[PDB]
Amino acid sequence: KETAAAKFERQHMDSSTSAASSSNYCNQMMKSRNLTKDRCKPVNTFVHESLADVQAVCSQKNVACKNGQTNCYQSYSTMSITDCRETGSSKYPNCAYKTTQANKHIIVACEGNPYVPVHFDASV
Numbered sequence: 001k002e003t004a005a006a007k008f009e010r011q012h013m014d015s016s017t018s019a020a021s022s023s024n025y026c027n028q029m030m031k032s033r034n035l036t037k038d039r040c041k042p043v044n045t046f047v048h049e050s051l052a053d054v055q056a057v058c059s060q061k062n063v064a065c066k067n068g069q070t071n072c073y074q075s076y077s078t079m080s081i082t083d084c085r086e087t088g089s090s091k092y093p094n095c096a097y098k099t100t101q102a103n104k105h106i107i108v109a110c111e112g113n114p115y116v117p118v119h120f121d122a123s124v
């Protein structure tokens with residue numbers, strides 16, 4: 001039992017690089033975060049900022065989540081991110097992804113004590 005907070009970090013944090021350099025980033029990262037183990041996770045964003053900067057979002061602009069709950073937060077500033085989306089031809093277990101590097105606001109849901117990100121809702 002990974003905590004929700006730990007799951008968020010595994011799925012979404014990539015503080016080791018400033019930006020995706022190559023079009024193969026998503027293929028590489030989705031595999032190495034074990035997001036293609038049982039199925040190809042269809043959509044996933046990686047954030048290239050410090051964990052502290054991402055946790056800090058829980059103290060920023062309170063917004064509704066896509067699901068209607070009101071424990072989401074939008075980052076005041078843009079962040080370096082990489083969107084990963086499975087291509088239409090991708091088939092498990094040969095998962096393939098489209099990599100898009102971007103600078104966008106992130107929206108995360110926060111929960112707990114400490115009050116930390118547990119879900120990535122969207123980028124703007």
Ligand SMILES: [Cl-]
């Ligand atoms: Cl989950």
